[PDB]
Amino acid sequence: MLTLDTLNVMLAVSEEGLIEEMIIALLASPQLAVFFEKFPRLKAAITDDVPRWREALRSRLKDARVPPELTEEVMCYQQSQLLSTPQFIVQLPQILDLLHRLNSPWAEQARQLVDANSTITSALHTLFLQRWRLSLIVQATTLNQQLLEEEREQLLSEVQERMTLSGQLEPILADNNTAAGRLWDMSAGQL
Length: 191
Fold this sequence. Notes:
The chain is mostly helical. Helices cover 68% and strands 0% of the residues.
């Protein structure tokens, strides 16, 4: 079962910036939307709840699996390095047929790529994985955009639950993960 944490490995990206968009997604959701207007003081809690949504998605990448669409994006990618050079030539227009089947954007690019060079010895095979790798990062923007919409619903019941803190406060435990990074420098000279 293809798990969601694979995206962190195969793209080498961090979740934190995408989790920030997920904060905006929740602050836009109808539950929090009405809560902010109806409770102009109590909203300060759930607007401060930014590093809490972090731990929700940080667990969820390990727990949850990939979207049904994304499944074939990552599987065709990882299959191409298992697909050895003699087998890769004859099953070349077949993996291209798979891309065209789903209507994935890699269908058009990989088609032109193999029309550019059908004499795949080593160079194109390497470029096939790399060209899709970079293209899958900017595509994962949309794939994980659909994720943050679905997951929003689940943790929406979770955030309206914790909303008890603004009416009969009863607390729960949570991790504090501070990304500590700084290097000041001012090496300059002027006469």
